[PDB]
């Protein structure tokens, strides 16, 4: 369960690895570790099985309800704050569960991309780039990151990071599903 | 290469004995002989090999000094003493079978890990499970059987035990009379 998010000048790129289960062989083409919160806000999650998907679907249902009720789209900041509040409320009276969330959006009012990361305790931090899973790659991002990079440069950096992760992984690392959030909405890259 | 554990069954027929041990197929047998006495050891493989070497040593010295082969009762006492020597570091389940060269009576016995002797007039089962095989032997056992009948009974018991939990399962059976010992293999 490894998730990455890179924010470039005009868009946000989110990459997620194929979900696997212990002792179970599955062949499918789907993204079950990512939910589209809104046409311009995407969410990726990684953590314990069961709880994480329930939390993600709960968040998606709440955000869709708000969008229908108000006939308007929430900003990425408001979405991230709501997710943080709900995550803090979830472990209010129970043992905390492992979960890490990357939220990437394109604020139309500010006309700029944004990316946030929330850990299992409910700590929301705005980041230029972020990753979770294997604990290697932060040095590669640091040496090859610029705030004014284009989409193609971000995709090249993501390809380099994916190759580096695959090399260390014992060849069990399958493909990576890549999505781009920008002014035109959310799309998936099949390259 | 795991070879720890096994099943050894000893039965007494009219004027004979039968001692059988499980195999693994896919060169390591658990039955050894020191003349007209047979010993089957179940448990840790290293302890089985150590006991085999030690008993070969002691039986060779006994034959050199006494100028005669050791009797099954004397060998039983020797095995009990050797097992009790390692009281705080004990090794397994040994089974002794044979026919006395003078009286001609069959003899079978079993041991615990510190040499407590259990002399059975009917049969002895040694192994890890020792529940399904014990029940099958109890149901199939009849006193005073001929060597052919005894062989059939013990082979049927082993086959029934094998059926209720393989590809590489085998068995070695010894039918021991006063003047002849027959060794046979069962391939299930």
């Amino acid at each position: 369960d490894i998730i990455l998010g890179i924010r470039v000048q005009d868009s946000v790129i989110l990459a997620s690895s194929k979900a696997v289960t212990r002792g179970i062989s599955v062949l499918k083409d789907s993204d079950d570790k990512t939910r589209q919160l809104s046409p311009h806000t995407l969410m990726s999650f990684a953590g314990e099985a069961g709880d994480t998907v329930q939390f993600a679907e709960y968040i998606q249902a709440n955000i869709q309800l708000y969008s229908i009720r108000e006939d308007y789209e929430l900003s990425p900041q408001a979405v991230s704050s709501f997710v943080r509040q709900e995550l803090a409320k979830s472990i209010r009276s129970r043992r905390p569960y492992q979960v890490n969330v990357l939220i990437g959006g394109y604020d139309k009012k500010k006309n700029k991309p944004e990316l946030y990361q929330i850990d299992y305790l409910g700590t929301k931090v705005e980041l230029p780039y972020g990753a979770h899973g294997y604990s290697y790659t932060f040095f590669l991002l640091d040496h090859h990151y610029r705030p004014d990079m284009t989409t193609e440069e971000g995709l090249d950096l993501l390809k380099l990071c994916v190759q580096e992760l695959e090399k260390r992984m014992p060849m069990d690392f399958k493909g990576v599903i890549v999505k781009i959030v920008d002014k035109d909405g959310i799309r998936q890259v099949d390259d | 290469s795991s070879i720890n554990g096994g099943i050894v069954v000893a039965m007494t027929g009219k004027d004979c004995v039968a001692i059988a041990c499980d195999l693994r197929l896919g060169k390591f047998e658990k039955i050894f002989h020191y003349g007209h006495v047979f010993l089957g050891i179940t448990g840790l493989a290293t302890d089985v090999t150590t006991l085999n070497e030690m008993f070969r040593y002691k039986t060779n010295l006994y034959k050199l000094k006494e100028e005669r082969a050791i009797e099954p009762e004397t060998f039983t006492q020797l095995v009990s003493s050797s097992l009790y020597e390692r009281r705080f570091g004990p090794y397994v389940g040994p089974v002794v079978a044979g026919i006395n060269s003078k009286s001609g009576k069959p003899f079978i016995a079993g041991f615990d890990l510190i040499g407590c002797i259990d002399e059975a007039k009917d049969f002895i089962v040694s192994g890890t499970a020792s529940d399904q095989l014990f029940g099958m032997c109890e149901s199939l056992y009849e006193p005073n059987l001929e060597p052919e009948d005894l062989f059939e009974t013990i082979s049927q018991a082993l086959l029934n035990a094998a059926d209720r939990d393989l590809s590489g399962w085998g068995a070695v059976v010894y039918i021991i009379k006063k003047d002849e010992v027959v060794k046979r293999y069962l391939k299930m």
Binding site: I24, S25, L27, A49, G50, D51 | -
Partner: protein
Amino acid sequence: MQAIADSFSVLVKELQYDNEQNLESDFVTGASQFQRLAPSLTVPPIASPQQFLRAHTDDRNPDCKIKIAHGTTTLAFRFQGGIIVAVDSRATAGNWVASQTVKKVIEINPFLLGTMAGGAADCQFWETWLGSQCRLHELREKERISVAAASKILSNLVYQYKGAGLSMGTMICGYTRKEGPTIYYVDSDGTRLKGDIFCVGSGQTFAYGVLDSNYKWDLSVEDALYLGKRSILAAASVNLYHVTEDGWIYHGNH
């Protein structure tokens, strides 16, 4: 006011029969215990029920131990016009004689199937419950329930008891007109996956390799059945189920 007077009027307390649940469970006031759509499960009235159950479930009569479905190889794949579900009929030794083959596959409906791959009692009970729920939904909506809906219902149910002690992993396979043939995997940890090929059991890597060698969408019924039988044999008496839009059909070895 009469109820208040009766509450402070004076044996039943020691019997704990002043509570509705105790009377209902002991079949005192009627057979309302066997009329609950959502069953009620007894929990020890202690601060640590989960640890109590875990400690007492690992302690030594073989007959009084919770039966566990054997980790036999189970396979499922959707080729063009149905779902092939393949299991191995290799019985285990025991102190009993079977009048028929072991039912390693649960028949939810004339259109749905499931696999145990876990605890036997949990799988049987909750898949019968899921069948009842699907029947009620079909009566209400006058249309066959989607496989996604049934899998989601089962997943929510097993998630509500997550961590309590349930242990079950099932494969819900179904062919509907709107969706086509679909296979979902539902785990006792709340996991719910959708897939085209599923292999589980003690040995499934070999079966998955055999499938990947000779899998394609443009198969046929006979070819798919042969592929499933070959995969089960290679992973090692191969029971097959072919699911089409009209329901499931069982084959002993063909």
